Symmetry: none
Subunit: 272 residues, 2 copies
């Protein structure tokens, strides 16, 4: 579908730069532009205006064309700007940390969300794409807490253009390799946030990289029961352990000893 | 010691920016400045004119004040009008010698083991004086007239830029640790064994630390990679050194040997 540049301008209040907490329209910055909240019809949307070019814009509609799925954020139209379905429960990161007073997701909800996201990735790999920026601030959540994977701003194969989010990137990606096995790794870190509710990196914490607690647990310096998010009363040891063992595997260092995303679909489905 | 700025201008030929290989005095660029070849008072020196704060100029004179060791490059003096003067190392970097640059002969296996052992002693001294080198590559390891090893030069959505060829993973992730110095040492040992450069854009694999994986999966063996420009490399000790290289390059930093153990493993090798 196609939108008017005049329309988008006025339903976002001439691109009101103020944060929505203040009463403006600025939902965030990312994906190589700023994201404003808009009202088209009697429905809310996400309007992205681009900023540090045309190359990045035409590609986003190329990748969005092939890949539409229940657990990917659906594009609606274009214009220079872009338009997405609006996810009013925000990022999984916002929810895992109860940003702004929201109540802690239950274990059941978290399990549904993992399974959900993992279907998103399986769809991208089925259709031979690599996300290259899987992280919990790019897993958005709609009115039903369905997982919707956002920011496709990056969607042997080498490169001198190394990019991603270092707290989440796998070792082979840090060096420049582009492979689906890297998305599994990053997805492994997203699982550890869901189990623990802790950030993937924290300057004032030991270990600073969440992905390091895995070593602490192999060396039996700790047990999973020590990192489990305590802001939740329906988690059972059995299925928590089972999810961890999946996180752990996505986290192997040798890219070929990692599970493909279809085997993650099973291990998580077999978890309920 | 202390020097005169205008005499360093004279002994380096007005600081001839041109490289040595064409008649100038520039030996290289590093350590936040350029590095020229000077001569003063019966001593060939290396002069590093700092470029574009001053706390920096006195903060390296701090470190170099304590760190004097058989295997570190020794500081001779300074000048604040801003330059540092070093003992010249007539055989250049280990990298230059591994690649037989300018037509020098290939270091023997036996020489390579001494050099290896050497640099680990320098690295061990630096870790005992609680110091993180952060840049162990085979071109920051210089060689004196005896081929003694002398070590020198010491998270939102983003993009990495550092020379991936030597940094460990956790370093590329922004951790700063001695365990990262060991990783880089590991790649040095593979350069030493193979004579190949740590990265080569027109080779598969590109990164030389990638061959470890290639060897583990049994697609190859360490023999397939041994520097042909040796005549004395016996299989046993080559595999021995590969074994240290292998442990050094362990992907999770706390599984890697501490530097004191690399010294041991390297010693038992002769």
């Amino acid at each position: 579908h196609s939108f008017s540049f005049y329309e988008l301008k006025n339903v976002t209040n001439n691109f009101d730069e103020r944060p929505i907490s203040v009463g403006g329209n600025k939902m965030g910055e990312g994906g190589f532009g700023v994201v404003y909240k808009g009202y088209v019809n009697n429905t809310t949307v996400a309007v992205k205006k681009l900023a540090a070019l045309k190359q990045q814009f035409d590609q986003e509609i190329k990748v969005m064309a092939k890949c539409q799925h229940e657990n990917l954020v659906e594009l609606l139209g274009f214009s220079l700007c872009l338009v997405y379905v609006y996810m009013p429960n925000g990022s999984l990161l916002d929810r895992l940390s109860c940003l702004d007073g929201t109540p802690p997701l239950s274990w059941h909800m978290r399990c549904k969300i993992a399974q959900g996201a993992a279907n998103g990735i399986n769809f991208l790999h089925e259709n031979h794409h690599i996300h290259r920026n899987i992280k919990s601030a790019n897993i958005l959540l709609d009115e039903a807490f369905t997982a919707k994977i956002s920011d496709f701003g990056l969607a042997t194969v080498m490169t001198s253009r190394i990019v991603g989010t270092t707290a989440y990137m796998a070792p082979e990606a840090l060096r420049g390799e582009i492979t689906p096995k890297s998305d599994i790794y990053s997805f492994g870190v997203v699982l550890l946030e869901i189990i623990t509710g802790l950030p993937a990196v924290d300057e004032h914490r030991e270990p600073q990289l969440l992905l390091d607690i895995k070593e602490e647990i192999e060396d039996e310096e700790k047990t999973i029961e020590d990192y489990i998010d305590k802001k939740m009363n329906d988690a059972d040891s059995t299925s928590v352990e089972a999810m961890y063992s999946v996180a752990s595997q996505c986290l192997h260092e040798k890219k070929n000893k990692r599970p493909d995303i279809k085997k993650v679909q099973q291990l998580l489905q077999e978890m309920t």
